């Protein structure tokens, strides 16, 4: 019903072994992981050996194909520091085996476009903003610090004043990602804000003249903090995570009312999370004994989306 799939990735272990740490995690097949004799069931659990490409294949690929066919979708990344969130989501820029989910999404989009030359015409608009201290901040125009979410006549959400930049190649998309990353709020390199990257795929069919439109959101979630300006960061981070969790949970349990309005991120993502929309949540975990509570913390958060 809900269309949310939660997938958990554990990374290989070192470099770190010199500390003295154990593996702490056992896998009952490919969808369940056991820690401290407690079982956590998911839709897929990627073990240490799982390649970048099959993470993309199982987590994101069908979502991309759906957006190229007119649907909306969302992929979330969630993880405590050094869990492998960045390796999973971005990976190694121009190494194909190699690269993480976001570069593979972009390559599939453009290969499809190239393979569909004349018969389909495309316009890809990308936007990039972060939820920092409950404020919507544009990562492509530092002057736009405090933007708002609204709904149109059809109850379709949009962020007012957000930069939309036209892109025509994979490099142009990646250039845009790097520009936004430069302005993203970091501390201690923890992300202190949640960042949302939007690819809007607009197409028109040359034979039939009919139009299609699809929105793919890539959300990098800041991890929950247990702790001045860094305190306001923690309470906002945590409150917005609980708002997401409430939505995500109401959809998973089939609630007829879903509390999208209780936070800005979920208002933005209302046309792309729940309903017809396709969603994958990738939670990244360290296997080390040193981080067992963090992992167990991440795992519980992932559990909220699990029917």
Residue numbers in the entry: 6 to 19, 21 to 194, 200 to 238, 245 to 324
Task: Tell me what the authors wrote about this structure, in their words.
Kinesins are a family of microtubule-based motors that play important roles in intracellular transport and cell division. Kinesin-1 transports cargo within cells, a process tightly coupled with ATP hydrolysis. Whereas kinesin-1 in solution is mostly loaded with ADP, ADP release is accelerated several thousand-fold upon microtubule binding. Here we characterized kinesin-1 P-loop mutations that interfere with ADP binding and determined the structure of the corresponding mutated nucleotide-free kinesins.
More importantly, when more mutations of residue 87 were tested, the T87A and T87G mutants were found to release ADP much faster than wild-type (koff = 2.77 s−1 and 4.80 s−1, respectively). Apo-T87A kinesin-1 was crystallized in a new crystal form following nucleotide digestion by apyrase and gel filtration to remove any trace of nucleotide. The crystals diffracted to 2.6 Å and there were six identical molecules in the asymmetric unit (r.m.s.d. of Cαs in pairs of molecules varies between 0.3 Å and 0.55 Å). The r.m.s.d. of Cαs of the apo-T87A kinesin-1 compared with ADP-kinesin-1 varies between 1.2 Å and 1.5 Å. By contrast, the conformation of apo-T87A is much more similar to that of apo wild-type kinesin-1 bound to tubulin, the r.m.s.d. of Cαs being close to 0.8 Å whatever the apo-T87A molecule considered. In contrast, apo-T87A differs from apo-kinesin-1 bound to tubulin in a small portion of the Switch 2 containing L11 loop: a stretch between Switch 2 and the α4 helix is disordered in apo-T87A whereas interactions with tubulin stabilize it in the complex. In apo-kinesin-1 bound to tubulin, the structure of L11 changes and E236 interacts with the Switch 1 residue R203. But in apo-T87A, where the structure of L11 has changed again, the R203-E236 interaction is lost and the E236 side-chain is disordered and not visible beyond Cβ. Since it is disordered in isolated T87A apo-kinesin-1, E236 does not make any visible interaction with the P-loop and with residue 87 in particular, leading to a higher mobility of the P-loop. P-loop destabilization, together with the removal of the nucleotide, leads to a tubulin-bound apo-kinesin-like conformation, as seen in the structure of the apo-T87A kinesin.
